[PDB]
Amino acid sequence: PTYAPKAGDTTRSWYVIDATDVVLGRLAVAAANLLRGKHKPTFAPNVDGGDFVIVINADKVAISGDKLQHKMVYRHSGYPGGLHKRTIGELMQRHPDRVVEKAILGMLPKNRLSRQIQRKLRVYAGPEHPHSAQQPVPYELKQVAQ
Amino acid sequence: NAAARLNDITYNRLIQGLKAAGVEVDRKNLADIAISDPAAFTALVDVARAALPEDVNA
Amino acid sequence: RIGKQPIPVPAGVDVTIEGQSISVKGPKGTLGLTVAEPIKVARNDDGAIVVTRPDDERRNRSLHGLSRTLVSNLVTGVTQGYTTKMEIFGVGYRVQLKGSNLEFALGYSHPVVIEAPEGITFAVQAPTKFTVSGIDKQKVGQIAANIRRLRRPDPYKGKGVRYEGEQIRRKVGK
Amino acid sequence: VKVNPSVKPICDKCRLIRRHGRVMVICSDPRHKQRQG
Amino acid sequence: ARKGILGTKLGMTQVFDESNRVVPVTVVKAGPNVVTRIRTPERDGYSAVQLAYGEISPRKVNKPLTGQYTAAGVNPRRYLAELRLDDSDAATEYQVGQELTAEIFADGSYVDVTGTSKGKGFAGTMKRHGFRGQGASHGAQAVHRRPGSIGGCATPARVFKGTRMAGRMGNDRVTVLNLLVHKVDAENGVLLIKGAVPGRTGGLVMVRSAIKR
RNA sequence: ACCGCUGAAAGCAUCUAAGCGGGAAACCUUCUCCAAGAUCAGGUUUCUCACCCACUUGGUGGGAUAAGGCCCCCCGCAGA
RNA sequence: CUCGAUGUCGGCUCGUCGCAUCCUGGGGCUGGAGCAGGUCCCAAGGGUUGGGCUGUUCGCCCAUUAAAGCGGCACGCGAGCUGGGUUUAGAACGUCGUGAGACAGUUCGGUCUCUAUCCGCCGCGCGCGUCAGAAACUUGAGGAAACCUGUCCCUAGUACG
Secondary structure (H helix, E strand, O other): OOOOOOOOOOOOOEEEEEOOOOEHHHHHHHHHHHHHOOOOOOOOOOOOOOOEEEEEOHHHOEOOHHHHOOOEEEEEOOOOOOEEEEEHHHHHHHOHHHHHHHHHHHHOOOOHHHHHHHOOEEEOOOOOOOOOOOOEEEOOOOOOOO | OHHHHHOOOOHHHHHHHHHHHOOOOOHHHHHHHHHHOHHHHHHHHHHHHHHOOOOOOO | OHHHOOEOOOOOOOOEEOOOEEEEOOOOOOEEEEOOOOOEEEEOOOOOEEEEOOOOOOHHHHHHHHHHHHHHHHHHHHHOOEEEEEEEOOOOOOOEOOOOOOEEOOOOOOOEEOOOOOOOEEEEEEOOEEEEEEOOHHHHHHHHHHOOOOOOOOOOOOOOEEOOOOOOOOOOOO | OOEEOOOOOOOOOOEEEEEOOEEEEEOOOOOOOOEEO | OOOEEEEEEEEEEEEEOOOOOEEEEEEEEOOOOEEEEEEOHHHHOOOEEEEEEOOOOOOOOOHHHHHHHHHHOOOOOOEEEEEEOOOOOOOOOOOOOOOOOHHHOOOOOEEEEEEEOOOOEEEOHHHHOOOOOOOOOOOOOOOOOOOOOOOOOOOOOOOOOOOOOOEEEOOOEEEEEEEEEEEEEOOOOEEEEEOOOOOOOOOEEEEEEOOOO
16 A cells, blocks of 8 residues: 655655746646656655745746737636736736746646645746745756657 | 656556566556665666667557 | 849948847948848858848748848948938928927927937928938838828828828819 | 628739738728728 | 825815805814824835824823834824825935924815715615615505615526625725815914815824825 | 838738837726735734743643733714 | 426616617728718727606607617516506406307406525624734735716817818
8 A cells, every 4th residue: 555645754845947948838737746746656646745846037938929919817806897807918027926826726636735735836937036045956847758 | 657757767668668578567566666665666667678679660 | 032132231340240130330320130040141252241041931031031131221221321201282381490300280289299219310301391311211111100190181182291202192073 | 991701803903912810902092992801 | 296294174164265255174283293204115115104193191002102103212192194105215305203294285286185984874775875766655665765676587696796785884095186275374283175074073184295186 | 990110922012921110988007995814814113022830841731920902881973 | 497386568776798889989981172971990988868648568759968779687677666558256348159158359446475594795793813922004916986978269260162
């Protein structure tokens, strides 16, 4: 049977991704699996496992103008109308961290652990990150084989 | 798959290689090995890599 | 066939490529230009500019011809000022040059003062004739676009700018 | 302009263009300036 | 830019102007009894100044407040409210100890006045929102003053959020814009404002310079 | 929507595929209001800032106290 | 699907939504001289009234208006209202039926039940957390309300004709 599940038997490391030229989707996927812990053999979907993920320089994520001017974002309030339609381009010019956050959350499962995982996410639009007291580990994207 | 990716190999080719080697080892105890002795997992990976032919053509 | 047209450089004071970017200096104000990355541009043995991309992508042909005419336009602009002339065919109009611009009012209140762009030359040839010149057909054309749609010239009698012709339409009697 | 789901030439002094995906006619004679939808 | 001062409403009266015209005047008392404590944007990006006004007893105000005010070096006051200034740097404008009076208004300048409105209490939609009341003769059993129907029946099987229903009103931060200051009584510190002001006699009034004009 | 600058594809032409600009009571800033239970639960300031037992020192309970607040009381043009 | 019950027209009251837009707004074209006006494109942010007669829908008409919009939401909404007509029992005229009686043909009268448990909504509190315990002032991510318009004068009796 399983050996990984156990209180305290988790290595909470920190990862840093320089999200400059990377595309939003591939970044979000790697962040999702890396965040949940599927890159580790001690996977245990029943618990909040995984490592901490830091997104650096989210402002520079390459997205075509064909989506900046067409991929609309919808936040309905609850009131009549109230469909807060706002372009992803404007969101990139205001709160790109919320755009990236949304993309990741859409790739994470929709359950209680998802929220416990969300609170393990730290996204900053700029490149200068004050969080240097911990042990950041620069992590880059790759294919494996095949 | 996680341990295999740590050894830079996919699950696909891992199982294919082990079958070519005749290593009729179930996934339960193989996954156990992944935790109890990661080095043994690495050894099995090297065996599979050597057993795999050359490419994706036939 | 546009790809076959070399680019003469009569001046060449600082006509040079600095990282997919053409710096141009000469008789008039200086110019610059970002080079379309897909297209390879290099200096000829005789000093002319060679714009080329060998591969087959058609958009490379569009960008090849395009960037060729952009560079030719840069050299033409820096060596020979661009000039567009404008003349009014109407009643009730006098051009004044108050401050640093042209004040127009074809028979209506609040005479319009065209906000000039940085780096542009204006001149008045008569109360109903004037001209604009510069080192950028886009900047000179910006004044042509700003003066447009300001009291739309009716095709009947006429009440606006013409560029010395253009076969402007005519009335149908009454 | 004459927006409609059909385009043809008013005379042989015009061109059919594809602007932003919309087909339209220019004929140096502002009579119709027809547009394909 | 948005200069201002705290005061209180002392009721309304009327006074005739130089053109033989009637000016309804609300009396807002805002004389030399307003002190400051700056809040620079360098620490939190707020960019504003705390205004204090009133009268208390030295044995009434609690220790955290006497600590703040005595740290500031300012005699304690009953009310405290912070006025947003401008989105610039300001800096060289207000300081700790600068006295602000009603003389800052130009005897005619338009101002925006805001404050807690008078309580009216829990009321039906006839007052809360102003519905057109239903008839009360031709068979109107027990519907006089009642809202009636809401939305649909089958498909929209819910009341839309934000409908106009019965509830409390009052005690709100009501702001009235572009009120004409009739006259700054600089000799007494009494600000005479054309028009009615939210709040009861004795209530707190916040006055600031208008921006539309 | 419309008009438009420069200019290719295609020696021309063209509001265009690179690129620039104008362009409406719609949209977003802007004006007013609620709002950190916004669980990412914020930020600034200030006060108090060792007190005694039980259990197993820790782990945990019990009692008391400072800031301060509440209860009760006198009132409100604030209020079921 | 619903007959061990979804209670039907019209009208009132209260909202929402589409745009195939009545007006306001932005433009093209014209057999658009100008005012006006035809047609077409964009646009839901507001407004879209008040009366006579019929039970009305639907229509007619007077007088105003920038305008007197088309539709969905159980032909919106009867555990919110009306009960005029429709569809109960009485009565009468006509037609048919020998007759009892019938008519989606007309004419008079003829009750409109429910103490709100849940969902949602509207308002205000108690508790706990917001990592020592508290008190003040506040950023406002994110949302709401509101978003209309005419007459006259000047330009100018000018341009145009």
